[PDB]
Amino acid sequence: DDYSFSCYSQLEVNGSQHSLTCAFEDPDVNTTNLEFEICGALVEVKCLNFRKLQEIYFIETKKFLLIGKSNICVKVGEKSLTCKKIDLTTIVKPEAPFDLSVVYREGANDFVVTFNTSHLQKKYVKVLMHDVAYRQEKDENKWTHVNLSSTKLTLLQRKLQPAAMYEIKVRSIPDHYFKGFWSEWSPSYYFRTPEI
Amino acid sequence: DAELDDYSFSCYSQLEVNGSQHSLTCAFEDPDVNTTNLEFEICGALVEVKCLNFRKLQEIYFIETKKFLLIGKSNICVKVGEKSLTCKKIDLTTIVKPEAPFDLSVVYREGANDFVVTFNTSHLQKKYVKVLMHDVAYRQEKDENKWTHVNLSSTKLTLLQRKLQPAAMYEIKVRSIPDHYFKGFWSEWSPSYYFRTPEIN
Ligand SMILES: *[C@@H]1O[C@H](CO)[C@H](O)[C@H](O)[C@H]1NC(C)=O
Structure with missing residues (x-):
């Protein structure tokens, strides 16, 4: 019933490329048909899709601008369940x-x-x-x-x-x-x- | 006579004004202030360094650099010799011209x-x-x-x-x-x- 989530970014984890890692706060959420996407404050690209693994969602990329906020959304099909505007520099681990x-x-x-x-x-x-x-x-x-x-x-x-x-x-x-x-x-x- | 307020100032940044290099320009709000022994310095939210000095260009203070973090606020200080007279914390992404x-x-x-x-x-x-x-x-x-x-x-x-x-x-x-x-x-x-x-017609 609740698709709330949290994320952490890491900077230059593999050369100049960063990562973003998201997971639902509720460990029992069925993630089978839930996807994650990020849009905005990206380098010459509108959106990126997370890769899902073991209930966790990952992106590794050089394409974060790190200046400005991004939109991270939980999607089922094209249907956007919940969204969060996040400045990637405020969630660094x-x-x-x-x-x-x-x-x-x-x-x-x-x-x-x-x-x-x-x-x-x-x-x-x-x-x-x-x-x-x-x-x-x-x-x-x-x-x-x-x-x-x-x-x-x-x-x-x-x-x-x-x-x-x-x-x-x-x-x-x-x-x-x-x-x-x-x-x-x-x-x-x-x-x-x-x-x- | 002379007052601290005489040394109030304002700044503007220009981002990627020269390729990937940025600029920051500061000036006293009072155009008549004797600036003879005044310099400007910026510290904080820079890359690889703690502080950078401005150049004085005829009543205007100027720096060209790529070394702005553009995250968080920097401290911009009027300097008398090497001591800070008065300072302002400024996020460089909020004063863009x-x-x-x-x-x-x-x-x-x-x-x-x-x-x-x-x-x-x-x-x-x-x-x-x-x-x-x-x-x-x-x-x-x-x-x-x-x-x-x-x-x-x-x-x-x-x-x-x-x-x-x-x-x-x-x-x-x-x-x-x-x-x-x-x-x-x-x-x-x-x-x-x-x-x-x-x-x-
Ligand atoms: C230093 O390293 C950790 C990795 O060891 C993070 O990448 C962190 O972002 C770095 N700290 C700074 C100041 O960027």
């Missing part, structure tokens, strides 16, 4: 951070935690905010979160348990100009703190 | 008793500011009693002979404003075009 690394500096008695990001967060200069989460790998229930705009974070050795395994991971969300959603978590990094 | 129309043409069609008015615009070939509203203004050459206006989206208009004075000289010109997603300001007028209506 960043790629996950990666190559997480931890360095110990004995002199400073601290840990330098770095991670890698997109080509784009460097091209588009100040746009993402990152969320670094860590916790004692077992025993401890909830995570400790630190927000930052750069790719480098310091943890004081003496603010962590000694001789203990820590788990640490990172994710990103558009923070300036762009808007959107949390990336997937990076793969976790595990390390054991110095004994005392 | 189109390039002026050109190559106006008006031709009487004998069969139809009308005049076909055509003109041209570089915006036809742009990726971004592609949709404009045009304002065509025309008046008898002998008139500060003034102008008739027609608003249109296309580059071709018809004027009906029965609506014009016969055997008379008309002046006509055209300008444009952004009309879809982009917002901003009227362009300059095309040069004025002059045509005479036929005599009538």
Whole structure:
């Protein structure tokens, strides 16, 4: 009865080409004869058809203008069920951070935690905010979160348990100009703190 | 004496004004302000850089660059030496001044008793500011009693002979404003075009 949906775009996922990914909010919707289409703010083309896979709808294309709003419609045959005007730059899901690394500096008695990001967060200069989460790998229930705009974070050795395994991971969300959603978590990094 | 308000300013962008390169132009609203040690800078919503400097071109401040993100708002600051005096957050897609129309043409069609008015615009070939509203203004050459206006989206208009004075000289010109997603300001007028209506029995 309700064909409401949500989408996320990703930018430069395969060279200069972007992607758009849409799915119904109701997981039980029969998608067998429902199609998705996007029209407007496209490069020299009126509309594009999504490809349907496993209840999800995908487009991979260079043809997003990224300036202005687009119209995304759920169609059965030619009949337009529901539509949504969306600026593709307001629903961006960043790629996950990666190559997480931890360095110990004995002199400073601290840990330098770095991670890698997109080509784009460097091209588009100040746009993402990152969320670094860590916790004692077992025993401890909830995570400790630190927000930052750069790719480098310091943890004081003496603010962590000694001789203990820590788990640490990172994710990103558009923070300036762009808007959107949390990336997937990076793969976790595990390390054991110095004994005392 | 001198007041902060003296340094209020306004800007306009032109998008793809030179191939893929854009422009941004800023000017103090007061034309008499001593600008001697004032510069302009823009920071934020740029590509690859944090900040760009404007060039000063005789009371006007100008930058040509491709490096506008065109997403979100930039900060445009009056600079005294290297310190910011006063700033404005501006979304560059909301202060677009189109390039002026050109190559106006008006031709009487004998069969139809009308005049076909055509003109041209570089915006036809742009990726971004592609949709404009045009304002065509025309008046008898002998008139500060003034102008008739027609608003249109296309580059071709018809004027009906029965609506014009016969055997008379008309002046006509055209300008444009952004009309879809982009917002901003009227362009300059095309040069004025002059045509005479036929005599009538
Ligand atoms: C950086 O990368 C992620 C992929 O890792 C997203 O593509 C995101 O859009 C990028 N951030 C910026 C600033 O564009």
